Amino acid sequence: ELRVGLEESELWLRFKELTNEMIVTKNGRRMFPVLKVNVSGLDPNAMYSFLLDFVAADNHRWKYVNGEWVPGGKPEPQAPSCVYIHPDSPNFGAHWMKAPVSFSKVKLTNKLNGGGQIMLNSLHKYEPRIHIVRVGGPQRMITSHCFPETQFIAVTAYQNEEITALKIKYN
Template structure:
């Protein structure tokens, strides 16, 4: 039996041009929290669910996600849209790569 899979957010896709085809590049996302709250989806809407974990001094981002094809040549990144379809979000400080 196949499991149903739904996405909370659309997949991020970017078209890349102007890179040196023979140079190596890495693509990543840096998540920046909009506020100090944890959020959860309840009855069709987002509601605050307390204070966020690990928002100590000096922590200005929510985590970095490195595209699994990184590093790779410019030619690779320019041949098709770069798609971040494996990104997962979590409220946990150590989300195991999520």
């Protein structure tokens, strides 16, 4: 059975319990913490690409009001994010299972941009998700996994200084 797990879930949980925030810029900002996934149960000899996208966790605009995050009252449908291809893709099961798959080069933007960058809506809450795509072989297959622990709000600057401090303490 294909097992997918979160490396350093203990650090992600420190961020989650304060409500995590991720900076988004015109040119795109890398994530801290970095999403790292432990994968076991692949065919060492089979071929896979690792994809990353962000699901809008709810249909609301959020705002930092008197030191607390609160959702707007007027939901809109959230068009899903674009997919980031892990640069080691495509690659052998063995490649993927030898060390945690780390998405350190994905950059989060707020502007439609050349590409590589993933555009998110500022002040929307997002749940990171991966697709492990079996490629090259005859029987194409996809396995998807969400990481609730890694939820954040996309912000142009940090609102909760407790987040600012955790980010600096552990980078």
